[PDB]
């Protein structure tokens with residue numbers, strides 16, 4: 001595990017979280033408790049989820065100075081977050097769980113999150129349409145949340161010293177911006193098209209038609225018909241997957257759903 005040892009970046013994350021004594025924070029991973037202490041100072045309460053019992057001495061040391069720290073000993077991927085009552089998430093995330101844990105937190109919901117990722121992963125999270133780093137991850141995150149990189153974090157900020165950079169990412173869920181029609185369908189649609197990101201949306205939808213529960217022939221015929229409901233839809237399915245904006249992919253999947261169910 002790479003522990004955050006540079007207090008300038010702890011200060012930064014804490015600051016980025018815009019904490020008041022009315023916020024309850026969820027922290028993923030205890031570490032040395034350096035981030036934990038700053039959270040307890042500035043928030044009403046902090047839940048820490050830690051899988052390793054060998055770090056208890058830090059927990060018991062902190063519990064002796066602060067009465068507003070509750071430690072949940074377990075695996076952050078397994079804990080039912082619906083049973084906890086918190087509005088914010090601030091953590092130096094264990095880089096192996098970065099993807100599933102993002103989508104679990106976003107699913108559960110929160111006012112704001114401030115999270116440490118590996119730099120390359122953060123780049124994909126914030127990437128603009130039409131770039132090399134734009135992919136399923138970009139769309140899956142942005143369609144649900146406003147994301148930005150707050151700071152680039154050097155290997156020197158951690159101990160032991162990593163091979164690569166990390167990044168502080170600020171996440172602000174915005175459900176009303178894009179309005180997804182059916183979450184399960186939208187997920188299948190993204191998986192399908194980003195399996196062929198440099199093809200047209202329509203050629204992508206055909207090659208991986210399995211994902212939307214069709215064979216290649218039904219889908220080919222489905223797309224010919226869908227095409228004929230308006231010219232906007234014609235221009236979108238003929239464009240390369242990685243060139244559609246999040247707004248276009250959400251808008252396109254919403255209509256392809258309504259087309260399919262009314263069929």
Ligand SMILES: C[S@@+](CC[C@H](N)C(=O)[O-])C[C@H]1O[C@@H](n2cnc3c(N)ncnc32)[C@H](O)[C@@H]1O
Pocket residue numbers: 001002003004005028029030031032033034035049050051052055074075076077091092093094095097
């Ligand atoms: C990157 S360190 C960050 C800890 C601390 N915030 C720091 O930077 O000083 C990862 C921490 O999360 C814990 N951890 C790793 N995997 C976990 C998991 N699946 N669930 C809960 N905790 C985990 C590790 O024991 C370790 O304490």
